[PDB]
Design a protein around this ligand. Structure first.
Ligand SMILES: CNCCCN1c2ccccc2CCc2ccccc21
Ligand SMILES: CNCCCN1c2ccccc2CCc2ccccc21
Ligand SMILES: [Cl-]
Ligand SMILES: [Cl-]
Ligand SMILES: [Cl-]
Ligand SMILES: [Cl-]
Ligand SMILES: [Cl-]
Ligand SMILES: [Cl-]
Lengths: 158, 158
């Protein structure tokens, strides 16, 4: 995965929408309750230089809010979630004002599990951001892709 | 939808595999039991010039075989399934020996519902056929895409 050079994490703060998503395995995104079917509501960079995600996930028949802390690492644009550092967030690219591309990656199995998203600042379709997402995906072993309409962007859990 | 010119339906006979699929609506393909999650096993052109699909679909916790008859119409490469002719099969392109691209289309609602597949003759990934599928999708309002690995191509219901 080619990660963003010169990321300024403080500039990604505030509201985002999940416009599109893709994963290595159909099972990660197939169902509305699938393990990687999460929607980014907000990014909150911390004083420590960590990244807080506010997520919505469909769980047990409702839209559940979760705050996930991705801690800074010695590799820029790469953040660790778990104590083993096997669950990471990889920031691929952003222009801070319109779009952000990132992946969750799990390195616990011999086969990499990956789910990547195209985030936008406003609940609208941006073809530019979707083309940058598709280009970033070309080198990745993706088997499922989803994209949402503006109606879905403003709905709880899309 | 741009349909194939000069289709020779008799040459599509025999074994096929669903390598990739895409749909207008996430709900059509999201789940393993989703309404358009069907796998093409065989095409059987009839003496009348109709097209018989042998399909596998995951239904009520098992892999169910269905024979679906798509009848010829006065428009070449377009076949009708139902008495209202609202459910059609549209053949977009084939080289008969390697790949076939087609869509199911439902015209009963004001918004078109579409699901399109990339079929291959052998249970292997063909990047050429996937690029021809992606190019055929560019003009279509697709919001979900799935692709399968060779293991999945040889498995009942993938
Ligand atoms: C099997 N575990 C999947 C974890 C998926 N994950 C995702 C997925 C996409 C984008 C970000 C994240 C951040 C970590 C996280 C937190 C809570 C649920 C899922 C996820
Ligand atoms: C809501 N109805 C969906 C019908 C989907 N359909 C598909 C889907 C993809 C490719 C071919 C077809 C042929 C018709 C058919 C027959 C049986 C189940 C689904 C489908
Ligand atoms: Cl979102
Ligand atoms: Cl580190
Ligand atoms: Cl895909
Ligand atoms: Cl198949
Ligand atoms: Cl007709
Ligand atoms: Cl998509």
């Amino acid at each position: 995965t080619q990660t963003m050079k010169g990321l300024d994490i403080q500039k990604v703060a505030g509201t985002w929408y999940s416009l599109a998503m893709a994963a290595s395995d159909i099972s990660l995104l197939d169902a509305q309750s699938a393990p990687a079917r999460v929607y980014v509501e907000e990014l909150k960079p911390t004083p420590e230089g960590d990244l807080e995600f506010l997520l919505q996930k469909w769980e047990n028949g409702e839209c559940a809010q979760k705050k996930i802390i991705a801690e800074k690492t010695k590799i820029p644009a790469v953040f660790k979630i778990d104590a083993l550092n096997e669950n990471k967030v990889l920031v691929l690219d952003t222009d801070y004002k319109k779009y952000l591309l990132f992946c969750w990656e799990n390195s616990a199995e011999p086969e990499q599990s990956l789910a990547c998203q195209c985030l936008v600042r406003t609940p609208e379709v941006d073809d530019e951001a979707l083309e940058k997402f598709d280009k970033a995906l070309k080198a990745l072993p993706m088997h499922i892709r989803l994209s949402f309409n503006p109606t879905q962007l403003e709905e709880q859990c899309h």
